[PDB]
Each structure stands twice: as structure tokens, then as C-alpha cells.
Structure 1
Amino acid sequence: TKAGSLTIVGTGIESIGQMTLQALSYIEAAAKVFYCVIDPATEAFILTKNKNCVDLYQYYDNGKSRLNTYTQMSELMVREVRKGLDVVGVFYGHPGVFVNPSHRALAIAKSEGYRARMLPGVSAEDCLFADLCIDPSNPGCLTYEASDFLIRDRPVSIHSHLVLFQVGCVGIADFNFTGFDNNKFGVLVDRLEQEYGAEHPVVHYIAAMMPHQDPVTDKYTVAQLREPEIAKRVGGVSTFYIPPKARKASNLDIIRRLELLPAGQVPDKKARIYPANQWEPDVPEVEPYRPSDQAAIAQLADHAPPEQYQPLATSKAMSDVMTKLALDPKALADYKADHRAFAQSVPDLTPQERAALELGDSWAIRCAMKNMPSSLLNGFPWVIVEGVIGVIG
């Protein structure tokens, strides 16, 4: 009902390319854009997309409490919302991951009755999984802010992934344009030594911020983080990844209750699905082509789509409108305001395509765009299986 909206979007980490299509489309549609980005190529890119941009980075200052900066950044965005403008806030990475002012501005906007939405983006942790070739699923992931990790004595699991953000500003509440003397870094290393031992690997991770750069994926021992030459390499964009030290055994009660029953058949806790985490100390070599793998590959020769497989069967007109709804926020708002009026003005839709848009139901749109076989009559693509379940079945 109320005039004025706040949409907060991300740029991702790597310059320009890690922005989502929808983030770009909201930046272009905005009446005003407020941005806080790392790299000048992303900044320049944003300014080519909207004529009314404000750099939020100017509200940092030497010795200025970051909390005061964040209150100011939030208020600049919400002031424009209250004047009835469609406002877009733009932050580095995912705009909600280790970001104070986005959450603050969205909560204020929401509480005063304005439309308020955060669109997800690619985080430094998303980059970490991709560059270190690890899956948070295998074997679970603990993610902490490094100072919070220490002050609140957050628990570590030696059996799961550990990721630490803001390791380059331990205990630091303020800002400095030339970066920080991270003098309390030794307090973090002491905790890592207690939890994992002095010989356990820590990966210094820096995602490439420009398209031509390589990531930093430097493995050090906990002990090596005490060498002054190495400690000095940790900066404001540094993240730590600590791999598991050991593998956790199966709970026989759960094995029974999940009927993975022939107990002898459950893989040894040391048995891995290819590939193994290469960062783990004493990483055993895992066979990519076991007899089960070779037999599955042998079946490819005679493979045909199962009877229940639903081939795409759509039209340019339907693909075009579904693309427009994703990439044109004004078209989306019009559609959400009046499904029927919008659907009836789309040129070249089949009667089924028109009907499907009029309803808006997932099922109607899926039947309109996929041939549903008689054999078949939500989505079900699971692309991971836990090893003990997989190897048994």
C-alpha cells in the first residue's frame, strides 16, 4: 500500500561477475542506489547502471565506531524510503552475511509498514567452498566471526569444517583507511592450538576479487601462524578454514532406527565417497572408479529417459514472460498486483500458458512448460547422499 520500498542486494565477492541477474535488475530499476563495495570496477559498473548512486563507504572514518557508521548508512537508505522512493542498498558478497546496516535498515522499513526485502548473494564462504573444493555437507560446517569465537568461547567440532570470518580485526570496534595492526591475533592462534594442536593445518583463504587473479589457498600449521612474516599476511579480507582432525563413528541406535540394518555392511567410519577433502591431515587416497562406479558407467550405453521423466515442452512466448518476471521488477510488481490483467496482455501465449499465469500456481506453470507422462500421474532433485546410506543402498 505505502509508497517507498527497500531492496538490499549483494555484488558477490569477485568483481562484477558474482552479482546475480536479479541484483543487477533491482540496481537498474531503483529511484536511488546506496552501495558499499570493495573494488573500483564493481563501483564503476554500478554507476553505469543507475544515475542516482551514493557511496556509503564515505561514512567510515579513522577512530569512528563502526556502529555509528552503520546507524548512518541505514538512516540514509530509510530516509529515501520514507520520502516514497524505491531504494536499493548494495553490499559486497551476500548483503546479510556479517553486515549490520542491511538488517537494521530492513527491520526499520518493515516496522514502519514499507515493502522490505533482502536478495541473497554469493558470500566469501560460498567462494571458500568453491575454491577449496569442499562441501559443507561432508562433514558439516561451523561458521563464526573470529572475535565472537573468542569472547563467547564458541564450540569447535574436530569432526566438521570450521570457517572463521574477520580474523584480521580481532577485538577491533573501529576503522582505519590504511587497515589495522591486528595485535590481538595471537589470542586467536592460542585458542586454535588448544582446540586442534600445533601441527593441525589452517588454510589462509582469500577469494580473488578481480577476474584475472588466483585465490590465496595457503595451508599453514597452527604453530606457523606465530611466525611474524606469516601473521602479517592476514588482512581485512582474510578468512580461515580449519579442516576436520578425525572422522566421527556411526550411532548404532540411528543405524537401527533408519534400517541401514545389516551392520557389517555399514562402511568403516574411515570410508569416504570420492573425493576426499584434500586439506585434511593424513588424507587417505580414495578410488574414483570402484567396481560400483564402473558398473554404473557401463549402464550409460543402453540408458533411456525413464517413463516418468518430464521433457521441457514450452514456447518462446512462455520462456520470454518467465524470464521477464525474473529480470524486470516492474513487470513482476504488475503481475503480482493483477495476475489476470498481466496474463491477458502477454502476446502469443497458448490458452494453457495464459491460464497458468492467471492462477500463478507452481503446478499449472510446470504442466504448461513440461510434458507430464501418464506414467507419472513439488521438485525432487537431491544431488547429495550421505556415504553410509549411499554405499549400503
Structure 2
Amino acid sequence: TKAGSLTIVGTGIESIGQMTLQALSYIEAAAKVFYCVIDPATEAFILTKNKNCVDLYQYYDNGKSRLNTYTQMSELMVREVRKGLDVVGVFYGHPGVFVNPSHRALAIAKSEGYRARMLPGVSAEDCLFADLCIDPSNPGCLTYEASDFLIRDRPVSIHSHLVLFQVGCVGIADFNFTGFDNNKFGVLVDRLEQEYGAEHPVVHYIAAMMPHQDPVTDKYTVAQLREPEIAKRVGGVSTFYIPPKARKASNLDIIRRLELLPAGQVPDKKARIYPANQWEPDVPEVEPYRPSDQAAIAQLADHAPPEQYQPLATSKAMSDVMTKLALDPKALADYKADHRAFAQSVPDLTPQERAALELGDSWAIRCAMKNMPSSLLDAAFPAVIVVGV
């Protein structure tokens, strides 16, 4: 193992709070931190967590190709990796979602034989789902960069969600500190009119970046985007959400092959699961408390945990060590280097807990931390599926 590693992490969108615990722990552990964030409170927070930080944002410039900036950003990180340092790169949101220099730097580090990993973060699209109250599952999600969407004539589905990033810099490859002169925005609007019609809704979405702010969730018709007062509101942190125009019908062959038949009464294409998408035009009211819902709720009074449910049955020592492995990158490295030596050094573990850590197998650890009922193991593996469409 060569000295030197690159770990790229995110900060999420909303200041500080949307950073993951592991992003924070790696920032603290790093020999050197390179960051590219928008809000100053997140920047200030990062600087309190590591004494050796460099702002990558200073490598942008007016009329300077963003591609040249990205090469430089990547090279600054990889240079420090080559010197043998544990380097952390920090990008706002998810660091691999609409981000060039992270993928570049990691690929170079990997190709030169250094440890390289991206830790996922909360993207603007994650925020969009939360704030617009939609689920990519229902009814599928198409996500594009706005210029790419136009230039390569990327397909839309009128029956699925559409999310467009970078709608504030349509056709612009460079940078200006005072913002983009988004003069080709009308080209995007023409495409949206062709695909959806002039009266179809488009949600202008800006996630709150500070904890006390509300998101921008402004619905406009496609036609309204041509109004100069509306178009000028679209900036560098603007994303568009375009809801579906209609519900798609079910395929009879698939209904048959999946054996969803009974008497033929699969629900209608508009027989929606509550709640309906509130952005979709002319969506009918969906009843939250149907007779089936009421009957399910009536069963709560007599509910008991099923015999195959596996209650948590762990110990402070085991919870402590699993927490430490998640929150202390140095402890994790030590454990990964020698499971046995690490496991045997952890105080207060039971024999089963020690053995499970010695092995490292997910099953053994799960087994040490949950009571597995005899009924369960006699029948016949994580299984947590929380969507039913």
C-alpha cells in the first residue's frame, strides 16, 4: 500500500446540517483539505475542523474555461496524494453529482495506484424530492444537465418526473463571479413547450441553503418562463422540476406474466396511492382513509410483534465499537488491517461479539446484535422494502 489517499466527500446543500457524520470525520482526519462550497457558514465550519484547508473556488475566473479550472482543482488534490498525504476533497451537495473535478481526481489517483474513494452526500435532487414531496419511484425520474438536454436532444417522458440541473447557464462553458448572462434560456423554454405545451407547469426549485430559509418552490407555466421578470429569477442554484402530464397504462402481457390477474381488476391507471403528486396538472383528490386503510388501522389495537421479527439485543460495548468504526477513520483502518488484533483489544465485548468482529462477516455481526427467533431460521436476507408500486 502506497502512502497517499484521496477521499472526496460532500457537504449536502443546506448549511452544515446536511453534511454526513462520515464526511465530517474524514475532514477532521485529513492531512490536507480542498473544498468547494457555496455558503460561508459551511466554509467557516470546515475551517474549524481542519487546520490545513485550501479553497478551490479561487481557481475559477472571469471568462476562464470551467474545464481549465477543473483540471487545476483536480491536480491540486492529486499533487498532495502523490506526496503521500491523506487528502480530502470537499464539494457541496453530493460530490459526484454534476461535478467534474472529483471524478477526474479520483480516476487519476486510482490509475496511479493510490487509495481513492468517494463518499456520497445529499444532492440538490435529494432536496428536491424532500421539498416538493415527490418520490422518484412514482412514476420514475429522468435527470439531465440543461445544456446537455438540449444539445443531445435527450428524451423526455410525459409520464415520469423530469429534473433539469444548471438551467441558469444554458450554453455557457465559462464563468463570471457576478453570475451568468443566461441569454440562451429561451432555447430551453422552446424545448419545454414542444415537449409539454405552453400551459404545463414547471417548478422553479431552490433548496434553502441556510437553516432558517424556506425553499423556493415556484410553479410557472412554460409560457410564463418567457416573461423577463420570471426568467431573471433563474440563477446558478436553480433547478427545474417538470411533473408528468399523464398516467401511463399497464401492460397486459406483464400483468399476466407477473400473475397480478385475479378477476382482471388491477387498479386503473389513475387509481392512485395517497398522496398524489400535487404539482401534476389536474390531479384528482385521493382519499387517505379508504375502507382498506381504516381496516388496517383497526388492526393496530391487537398488534403484537410477529414471531419472525428480530428484536435488537446488543450491548453498550458492541454498539460503542460499531459506532467507532463508523465515526473514527483511524479505528476503521486499524480494524481493516487486522480484524483479530483489533477485536481482541476492544474492552467488555462478549465472546460472540469478539468472534463476530474477528470474522467481519455481516451475518455474524447482525447475529451478535439481533435475537434471531427459532421460527425464522426454520423457515429458511436483510429485506426492508418500503415502496409498493
Confirm or deny a common fold (TM above 0.5): yes
Distance 1:57 1:28 in 2: 20
Deviation of 1:84 after TM superposition, in Å, equals 0.3
Deviation of 1:261 after TM superposition, in Å, equals 1.3
Question: Aligned with 2:267: secondary structure?
Answer: coil
Deviation of 1:384 after TM superposition, in Å, equals 5.7
Q: 1:95-244 residue pairs with structure 2 within 5 A? A: 95-244=95-244
Which residues of structure 2 form unaligned runs of 5+? none
Deviation of 1:181 after TM superposition, in Å, equals 1.0
- Map of 1:12 onto structure 2: 12
- Cα root mean square deviation, aligned: 1.6
Task: Return closer, same or farther for 1:116/1:144 CA change in 2, 3 Å cut-off.
Answer: same
Distance 2:381 2:252 in 1: 29
Distance 2:225 2:335 in 1: 55
Deviation of 1:262 after TM superposition, in Å, equals 2.5
- Map of 2:286 onto structure 1: 286
Distance 1:240 1:263 in 2: 42
Task: Return closer, same or farther for 1:268/1:381 CA change in 2, 3 Å cut-off.
Answer: farther
Distance 1:381 1:375 in 2: 16
- Map of 1:346 onto structure 2: 346
Question: Aligned with 1:264: secondary structure?
Answer: coil
Deviation of 1:264 after TM superposition, in Å, equals 2.9
Task: Return closer, same or farther for 1:382/1:225 CA change in 2, 3 Å cut-off.
Answer: farther
Task: Return closer, same or farther for 1:40/1:371 CA change in 2, 3 Å cut-off.
Answer: same
Task: Return closer, same or farther for 1:112/1:210 CA change in 2, 3 Å cut-off.
Answer: same
In the superposition, the TM-score normalised over structure 2's length comes to: 0.98
Distance 1:125 1:140 in 2: 13
Task: Return closer, same or farther for 1:79/1:191 CA change in 2, 3 Å cut-off.
Answer: same
Task: Return closer, same or farther for 1:148/1:175 CA change in 2, 3 Å cut-off.
Answer: same
1:37-64 Cα offsets, whole Å, 9 max, x none, are: 0000000000000000000000000000
Deviation of 1:318 after TM superposition, in Å, equals 0.2
Deviation of 1:316 after TM superposition, in Å, equals 0.4
Deviation of 1:381 after TM superposition, in Å, equals 6.6
Task: Return closer, same or farther for 1:380/1:202 CA change in 2, 3 Å cut-off.
Answer: farther
Deviation of 1:311 after TM superposition, in Å, equals 0.5
1:218-253 Cα offsets, whole Å, 9 max, x none, are: 000000000000000000000000000000000000
Question: Aligned with 1:265: secondary structure?
Answer: coil
Question: Aligned with 1:81: secondary structure?
Answer: helix
1:65-124 Cα offsets, whole Å, 9 max, x none, are: 000000000000000000000000000100000000000000000000000000000000
Task: Return closer, same or farther for 1:327/1:174 CA change in 2, 3 Å cut-off.
Answer: same
Question: Aligned with 2:89: secondary structure?
Answer: strand
Distance 2:303 2:228 in 1: 59
Question: Aligned with 1:73: secondary structure?
Answer: helix
Deviation of 1:380 after TM superposition, in Å, equals 5.8
- Map of 2:311 onto structure 1: 311
Question: Aligned with 1:33: secondary structure?
Answer: strand
Task: Return closer, same or farther for 1:307/1:295 CA change in 2, 3 Å cut-off.
Answer: same
Which residues of structure 1 form unaligned runs of 5+? none
Distance 1:306 1:228 in 2: 60
Distance 1:239 1:51 in 2: 34
1:109-167 Cα offsets, whole Å, 9 max, x none, are: 00000000000000000000000000000000000000000000000000000000000
Identity of aligned residues (%): 99
Question: Aligned with 2:71: secondary structure?
Answer: helix
Deviation of 1:22 after TM superposition, in Å, equals 0.2
Distance 1:90 1:134 in 2: 28
1:333-381 Cα offsets, whole Å, 9 max, x none, are: 0000000000000000001000000000011001110011111119967
- Map of 1:390 onto structure 2: 388
Deviation of 1:382 after TM superposition, in Å, equals 6.1
1:12-47 Cα offsets, whole Å, 9 max, x none, are: 000000000000000000000000000000000000
Task: Return closer, same or farther for 1:32/1:93 CA change in 2, 3 Å cut-off.
Answer: same
Distance 2:260 2:371 in 1: 36
Deviation of 1:283 after TM superposition, in Å, equals 1.1
Distance 1:186 1:390 in 2: 39
Question: Aligned with 1:9: secondary structure?
Answer: strand
1:274-297 Cα offsets, whole Å, 9 max, x none, are: 000000000100000000000000
Deviation of 1:265 after TM superposition, in Å, equals 1.5
In the superposition, the TM-score normalised over structure 1's length comes to: 0.97
Question: Aligned with 1:377: secondary structure?
Answer: helix
Distance 1:113 1:11 in 2: 27
Deviation of 1:383 after TM superposition, in Å, equals 6.2
- Map of 1:88 onto structure 2: 88
Question: Aligned with 2:156: secondary structure?
Answer: coil
1:183-215 Cα offsets, whole Å, 9 max, x none, are: 000000000000000000000000000000000
Count of aligned pairs = 388
Task: Return closer, same or farther for 1:122/1:216 CA change in 2, 3 Å cut-off.
Answer: same
